[PDB]
């Protein structure tokens, strides 16, 4: 099935329970049986219309004998309608097959801009490159003062302004928004 | 994005990333290829007489007809990159051949001179002049080629 | 919620770079702190206000000498963002009874027995 399978609008059997938007995503943060994908640069909610347009715009410019695309986010289940929570760093749609990144860059960027939250078209190589250069940034920054250091040491009494979650987010994640430039 | 507390904004500004600054700008600081190599090396011994022209102003059909009239004889027409032909001259020890091949160049490798009839054919098209060649390690200009033909 | 902040102990573990930078020897540490309040306790929690009162730092820019011992240091850690701490330096040793009235606290942190 080298195509994005149709997803149900709502689950047949509702589930009781098991902010899912703020902070980095913990699951589906790494490629699994794919080579390209769409990465969420910020949290948000995916609607059924959003999913349907993902599937449409991916399966339109699709080569089933050379491209296979899979979801990484489940069907809309959270009641509000039904939506899916997505956190920053979460892959949305993965692709694989005998293909090159520029072959998909165009419409992947288009569909990422379509997405309600900030999103990016990321290959395995680009994901590794951005992770490595983020590590390089945090290792070579010439600023003696970092959000992590100041918040942990409660310098200037700054925890009176900050949140308890800021100690773990180290200033990179502020609410649902994610700031990759923030070292 | 909702407005942060001003103290938090000051914290973010002070903790903004500072890239390392190099003192001196690094910028302002200091198998088809081998197939062509071997084929041209073999051709340099296969051919006995060689000539070059500028067969680029011709149309597709005119070039096809010229190729047919050349294949009527045992002569074979060749095109090869100057980018790779320049090393070939020094590899085959052809020093006088350096100021001969630049831009478009079409070789006319042969062993039996039908250059009389080839010049006769070229005459009816008053362009595409003959360019100097080098038969059996002996350079011949256009006048030398004409004398050899006669 | 806003609560007391537990400073991780690694914050108060000096490095050799810190030793070179600030000029204090971890072996033979200084005996006394000179603490001055340099920040208002207004808009600070009641526990910081209380620690400031306990340490006697109600007046800003008025040096107060305290022991460099773990309990005093815990209080100072609670209010470290409101104060400036400098070691008390005794080039001529602690003053004798004869010159107890002729001392002066130099801005460098040195208690000199001549003034």
């Amino acid at each position: 099935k080298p195509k994005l399978r149709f997803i149900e609008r709502a689950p047949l059997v509702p589930k009781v329970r098991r902010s899912d938007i703020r902070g980095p995503s913990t699951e589906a943060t790494e490629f699994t049986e794919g080579n390209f994908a769409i990465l969420a640069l910020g949290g948000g909610y995916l609607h059924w219309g959003h999913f349907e347009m993902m599937r449409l715009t991916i399966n339109r410019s699709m080569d089933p004998k050379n491209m296979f695309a899979i979801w990484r986010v489940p069907a809309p289940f959270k009641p509000i309608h039904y939506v899916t929570p997505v956190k920053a760093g979460r892959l949305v749609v993965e692709m694989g097959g005998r293909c090159e990144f520029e072959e998909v860059q165009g419409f992947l960027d288009q569909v990422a801009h379509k997405l309600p939250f900030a999103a990016k078209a990321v290959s395995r190589g680009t994901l590794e490159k951005m992770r490595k250069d983020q590590e390089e940034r945090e290792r070579n920054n010439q600023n003696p003062w970092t959000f992590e250091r100041i918040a942990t040491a409660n310098m200037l009494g700054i925890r009176k302004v900050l949140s308890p979650y800021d100690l773990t987010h180290k200033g990179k994640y502020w609410g649902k928004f994610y700031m990759p430039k923030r070292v | 994005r909702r407005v942060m507390h001003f103290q938090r904004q000051k914290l973010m500004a002070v903790t903004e990333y500072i890239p390392p600054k190099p003192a001196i700008h690094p910028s302002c600081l200091p198998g088809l290829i081998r197939l062509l190599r071997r084929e041209i090396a073999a051709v340099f011994q296969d051919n006995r007489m060689i000539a070059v022209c500028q067969n680029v102003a011709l149309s597709a059909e005119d070039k096809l007809l010229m190729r047919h009239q050349l294949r009527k004889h045992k002569i074979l027409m060749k095109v090869f990159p100057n980018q790779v032909l320049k090393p070939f001259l020094e590899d085959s020890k052809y020093q006088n051949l350096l100021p001969l091949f630049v831009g478009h160049n079409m070789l006319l490798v042969s062993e039996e001179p039908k250059v009389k009839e080839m010049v006769r054919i070229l005459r009816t098209v008053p362009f595409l002049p003959l360019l100097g060649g080098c038969i059996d390690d002996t350079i011949l200009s256009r006048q030398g080629f004409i004398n050899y033909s006669k | 919620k806003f609560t007391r902040s537990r400073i991780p102990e690694k914050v108060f573990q000096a490095s050799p770079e810190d030793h070179e930078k600030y000029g204090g020897d971890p072996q033979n540490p200084h005996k006394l702190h000179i603490v001055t309040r340099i920040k208002s306790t207004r808009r600070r929690p009641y526990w910081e206000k209380d620690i400031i009162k306990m340490l006697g730092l109600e007046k800003a820019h008025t040096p107060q000498v305290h022991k460099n011992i773990p309990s005093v240091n815990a209080k100072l850690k609670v209010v470290k963002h409101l104060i400036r701490i400098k070691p008390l330096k005794l080039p001529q040793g602690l003053p004798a009874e004869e010159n107890m009235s002729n001392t002066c606290l130099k801005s460098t942190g040195e208690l000199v027995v001549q003034w």
């Binding site: 100041i150 200037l156 | 001003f6 | 108060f12 000096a14 930078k21 540490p29 470290k80 070691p87």
Partner: peptide, 29 residues
């Protein structure tokens, strides 16, 4: 209305942070 951080404000905060770092060092012994 939005507010912005000036170089003077950043320098003042940095001065305060330096004082606090020295406080950390002197409290470490």
């Amino acid at each position: 209305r939005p507010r912005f951080v000036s170089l003077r404000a950043k320098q003042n905060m940095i001065r305060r942070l330096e004082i606090e770092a020295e406080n950390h060092y002197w409290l470490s012994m």
